[PDB]
């Protein structure tokens, strides 16, 4: 059974090949205590990783090891992988090959560092590394299409063809879940709620996942929200306080389609998807339009499928047909696609064996698995 | 002439447009006698507002109507404004327009009640609300730079590239002069001095204003103070006792650059300036670096400009040059900038007329003012 | 066989590590005669300390060497420790380490002289100085909760979450049982009983320890006490006189919740605990509401637990469940908690050895103890 570990900026999913759901899904944070300890004999640890950090997040400084898709701290990344195998999964990687997932347009330094870290610290027998966006379409069951990969890192639009990522057609986008979370607390201060610390950032993320939604029409919804109190909903903080949000429900997710709210010159995810398609060839343009698949936790807002379809329809020519595919399992689309690829019989051919790694060195990752 | 009232968390300044200095500067405190009146010869008013309460602060419970730039008690705020117009400025508000100041990233209800009070209690012909940090740049004769304002409640960094401030790059911290005063009396107990009541709080503020200074090198200065003498200063209390403070002279201002002493996860006043600049465009970063402006009473410590320059230089790339501008009259920079704006002929069309407020109610303050 | 000495403002409890109750408990008063002896046969001494002073309290002038948790007379403090070790415990401190307790937010010079005196007059092998509130949580066996330690001179609240204390949320109030005793004798003159001398203060303290109680509703109980005589109780003075106290039973403990009676501006103990919790983070507030711990002799009034629960519930959000822990042995919680600390195997690495003190001096206690 080959492990399928999908590291991510927000959450990392781990499990086994052939399963339909990840075994362990915990936040990818590494918190350290900022206060000195007074009670002796408790055996308190120095660093808390995963669910332990979230439970005790009040007295910790939560730092995300991965920011904007690049690992800014390679010492904390080893801590999370160590916690994934021994603690959450309780399986020694000595007898199980490990599958890792990259990000589109990843620097070559990260590619070799991931191979070097695991082949020595964990010494797994075999490895294969694949693109997260590529695996997103594999879970949906189609090999050709354009993936609107979004998450807590950076939004990527990768129009893969025949299971291969087009390198020139990939368009980056920094609009992600973290930006909306930071933007939500900036506009929540207008009602008198002040969330500033990193511990309270997790609280805002819970609000975004439960109450926020995408409105079909922004101008129509704005007038309705001001006139009537129907749109207001109540949320309860961990301390017992009750808060009310009236029109922030459809104003924070709207920043995806209108980045000018955050002050970014780049266009929204509706126009980036259209721009990426235009970069591809004319003949294969027909197939990509009808096989667009959303992925990641950012695209889980209610009504985002309808808003995206309507707005991309106007930009696209009237001859083109739009079919936004939004599977309900799109949160774990990256992991599920990885499990499908690992379980394949022909997948044994492109393993990176431990014996082959020593003779070739860390540079084998560039040419073997691409 | 147009009255320019700059209500502040600690002190409020009121005057006339075109003047070079505020006419009246008194503390923004409202006190009520906790003890029972025993004599009948004198008036023995219910409450005292301004410097009247400061003189009799022994027998009163001083309460600040403004906390962190938000008016917590609107009953006491009406007392202060009634005292400003009728006792200090001794003018009728019914004939002169009034210009007010509000901190950025404030609750919408804070400036909505300000419009309602002005147009219903004092019947001012016109009104306007302006950002405190924006006016601080006008007093220095600049229209392109970053303003580091710091008072009693708010310490906000507002990068202003043009006549209008950049909204997406505004950073606000709830660490200011009042927070340092509470920290100064906490570490003063280490030497055996106990200041608890609000009347004793005003004594600590005098000590902070006269003896505290920012050390260029905190680690080196702590070792120097460990050798005793050459750094202890003597202060005389209103009772008559003489107190000596050693390393507390620079420890209290050091909480600005190291907020971890107060248990706040927020970054220091030096990092929050660099972070604010990083949110702007690449082309504009060159101008903002060389046009940094300090303002407010908190930044009046001896040597804060020198210390701030060193900290920013290490964080900023060595190619860029850092020039911190510290005008001699930066205490009244907020009011002086407002005087220039009010006296401008173009500003006559930006006033909110009485008829305009009636047709739209208090909500017009959000759409017109900024 | 570590000694655990818990010196307090009123009573000092000294015993042995590993036991369940203090070995010797005697009042911490040092009294000297104000007359001149006439009989030469009797072996009169110079000063009387401990239970000996209480027996002859009618002649001596009782003086408390500890005031508000601060040793105001170091000459007398040595006498109590000299009497404790060689008369009550009857052990030599030259072979056993000594554990001492000190209130938080105390002058740094207080614990500096504590280390110097024992290490030079008694020559103890080791030392450790612990916060009184921290030890109180050890007795309960818990690890998370806000501890209210109301003693004889100091009322302080120290919140602790998962063994990590929060130094910025510690609130200290200089209002405790001794101040209530001073207030009780002030209102006892309203009935015709005059207690002025320091010897008669101990008589008032005996009245408070037996008859005073905390009323659930002060406004309702005040009317009832003035309309009937069911609340009146009779107490017998040492001289044989019988006194009757009515509404003063629930008025003296009422100064804890309404310090305005004493003329102080500080908030009540119910508001101080709530203010301490509010200083903490949002995520840890839920666990601190359900783990409130009371200790000290001041919190032994009948019904103080019920009154505190009602008062906090009004301030706290309705959704939260306030659970106040009132163990029957909360009087000796500080000592019992210190017994567990001294007997722990992990604690043997935190003793302040003689060699460590020799190389540095009295300042070693600052960097080795919280």
């Amino acid at each position: 059974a080959a492990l399928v570990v999908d590291n991510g900026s927000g959450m990392c999913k781990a499990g086994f090949a052939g399963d339909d759901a990840p075994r362990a899904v915990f936040p990818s944070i590494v918190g350290r205590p900022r206060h000195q300890g007074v009670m002796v004999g408790m055996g308190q640890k120095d660093s808390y990783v995963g669910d332990e950090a979230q439970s005790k997040r009040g007295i910790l400084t939560l730092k995300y090891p991965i920011e904007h898709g690049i690992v800014t701290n390679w010492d904390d990344m080893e801590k999370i992988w160590h916690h994934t195998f021994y603690n959450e999964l309780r399986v020694a990687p000595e007898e199980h090959p490990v599958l890792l997932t990259e990000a589109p347009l990843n620097p070559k330094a990260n590619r070799e560092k991931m191979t070097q870290i695991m082949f020595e610290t964990f010494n797994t027998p075999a490895m294969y590394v694949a693109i997260q966006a590529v695996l997103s379409l594999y879970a949906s069951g189609r090999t050709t299409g354009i993936v609107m990969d979004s998450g807590d890192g950076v939004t990527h639009t990768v129009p893969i063809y025949e299971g291969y990522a087009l390198p020139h057609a990939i368009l980056r986008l920094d609009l992600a879940g973290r930006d909306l979370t930071d933007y939500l607390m900036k506009i929540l201060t207008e009602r008198g709620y002040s969330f500033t610390t990193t511990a309270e950032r997790e609280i805002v993320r819970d609000i975004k996942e439960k109450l926020c939604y995408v409105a079909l029409d922004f101008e129509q919804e704005m007038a309705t929200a001001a006139s009537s109190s129907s749109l207001e909903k109540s949320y309860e903080l961990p301390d017992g306080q009750v808060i009310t949000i009236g029109n922030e429900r459809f104003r924070c997710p709207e920043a995806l389609f209108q980045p000018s709210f955050l002050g970014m010159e780049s266009a929204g995810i509706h126009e980036t998807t259209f721009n990426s398609i235009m970069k591809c060839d004319v003949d294969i343009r027909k197939d990509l339009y009808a096989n667009t698949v959303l992925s990641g936790g950012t695209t889980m807002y209610p009504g985002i499928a309808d808003r995206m379809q309507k707005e991309i329809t106007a930009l696209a020519p009237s001859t083109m047909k739009i079919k936004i595919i939004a599977p309900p399992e799109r949160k774990y689309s990256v992991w599920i696609g990885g499990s499908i690829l690992a379980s394949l019989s022909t997948f044994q051919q492109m393993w990176i064996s431990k014996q082959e790694y020593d003779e070739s060195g860390p540079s084998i990752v560039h040419r073997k698995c691409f | 002439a147009a009255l320019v009232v700059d209500n502040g968390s600690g002190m409020c300044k009121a005057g006339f447009a075109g003047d070079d200095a505020p006419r009246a500067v008194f503390p923004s405190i409202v006190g009520r006698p906790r003890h029972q009146g025993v004599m009948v010869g004198m008036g023995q008013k219910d409450s005292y507002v301004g410097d009247e309460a400061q003189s009799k602060r022994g027998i009163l419970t001083l309460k600040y109507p403004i906390e962190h730039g938000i008016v917590t008690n609107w009953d006491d705020m009406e007392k202060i404004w009634h005292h400003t117009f009728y006792n200090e400025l001794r003018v009728a508000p019914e004939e002169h327009p009034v210009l007010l100041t509000e901190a950025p990233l404030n609750p919408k209800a804070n400036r909505e009640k300000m419009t309602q009070i002005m147009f219903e209690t004092f019947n001012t012909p016109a009104m306007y609300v302006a950002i405190q940090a924006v006016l601080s740049l006008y007093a220095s004769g600049r229209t392109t730079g970053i303003v580091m304002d710091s008072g009693d409640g708010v310490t906000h960094t507002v990068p202003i590239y043009e006549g209008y401030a950049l909204p997406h790059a505004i950073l606000r911290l709830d660490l200011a002069g009042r927070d340092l005063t509470d920290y100064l009396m906490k570490i003063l107990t280490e030497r055996g001095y106990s200041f608890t009541t609000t009347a004793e709080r005003e004594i600590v503020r005098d000590i902070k204003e006269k003896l505290c200074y920012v050390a260029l090198d905190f680690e080196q200065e702590m070792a120097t103070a460990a050798s005793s003498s050459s750094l202890e200063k003597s202060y005389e209390l209103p009772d008559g006792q003489v107190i000596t403070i050693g390393n507390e002279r620079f420890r209290c201002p050091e909480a600005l650059f190291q907020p971890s002493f107060l248990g706040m996860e927020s970054a220091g006043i030096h990092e929050t300036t660099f972070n604010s600049i990083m949110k702007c465009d690449v082309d504009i970063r060159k101008d903002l670096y060389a046009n940094t402006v300090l303002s407010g009473g908190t930044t009046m410590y001896p040597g804060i400009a020198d210390r701030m320059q060193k900290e920013i230089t290490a964080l900023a790339p060595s190619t860029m040059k850092i020039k911190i501008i510290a005008p001699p009259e930066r205490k009244y920079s907020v009011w002086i900038g407002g005087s220039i704006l009010a006296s401008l002929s173009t500003f006559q069309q930006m006033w909110i007329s009485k008829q305009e407020y009636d047709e739209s109610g208090p909500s017009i303050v959000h759409r017109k003012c900024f | 066989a570590a000694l655990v000495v818990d010196n307090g403002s009123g009573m000092c409890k000294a015993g042995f590590a590993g036991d369940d109750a203090p070995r010797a408990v005697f009042p911490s008063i040092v009294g000297r005669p104000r007359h001149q002896g006439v009989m030469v046969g009797m072996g009169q001494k110079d000063s009387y300390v401990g239970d000996e002073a209480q027996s002859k309290r009618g002649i001596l002038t009782l003086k408390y060497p500890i005031e508000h948790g601060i040793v105001t007379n170091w000459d007398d403090m040595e006498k109590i420790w000299h009497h404790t070790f060689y008369n009550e415990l009857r052990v030599a401190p030259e072979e056993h380490p000594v554990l001492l307790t000190e209130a938080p937010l105390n002058p740094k010079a207080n614990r500096e002289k504590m280390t110097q005196i024992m290490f030079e007059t008694f020559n103890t092998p080791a030392m450790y100085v612990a916060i009184q509130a921290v030890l109180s949580l050890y007795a309960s066996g818990r690890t998370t909760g806000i501890v209210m330690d109301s003693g004889d001179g100091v009322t302080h609240t120290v919140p602790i979450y998962e063994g990590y204390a929060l130094p910025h949320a510690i609130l200290r109030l200089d209002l405790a049982g001794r101040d209530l005793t001073d207030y009780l004798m002030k209102i006892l003159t309203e009935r015709g009983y005059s207690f002025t001398t320091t010897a008669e203060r101990e008589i008032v303290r005996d009245i408070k320890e037996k008859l005073c109680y905390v009323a659930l509703d002060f406004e309702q109980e005040m009317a009832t006490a003035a309309s009937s005589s069911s609340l009146e109780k009779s107490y017998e003075l040492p001289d044989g006189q019988v006194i009757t106290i009515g509404n003063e039973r629930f008025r003296c403990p009422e100064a804890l919740f309404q310090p305005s009676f004493l003329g102080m501006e500080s908030a009540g103990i119910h508001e101080t605990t709530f203010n301490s919790i509010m200083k903490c983070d949002v995520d840890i507030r839920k666990d601190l509401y359900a783990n409130t711990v009371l200790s000290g002799g001041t919190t032994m009034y009948p019904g103080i637990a019920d009154r505190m629960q009602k008062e906090i519930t009004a301030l706290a959000p309705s959704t939260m469940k306030i659970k106040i822990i009132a163990p029957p042995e909360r009087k000796y919680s500080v000592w019992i908690g210190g017994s567990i600390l001294a007997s722990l195997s992990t604690f043997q690495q935190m003793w302040i050895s003689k060699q460590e003190y020799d190389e540095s001096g009295p300042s070693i206690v600052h960097r080795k103890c919280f």
């Binding site: 009602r191 008198g192 709620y193 002040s194 969330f195 500033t196 309270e200 903080l237 306080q241 808060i243 | 906390e67 962190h68 730039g69 938000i70 917590t72 609750p107 409640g153 709830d174 | 509010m278 949002v282």
Partner: peptide, 7 residues
């Protein structure tokens, strides 16, 4: 404030 801080 309402939720957070004291203001």
């Amino acid at each position: 404030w309402x939720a957070x801080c004291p203001a």
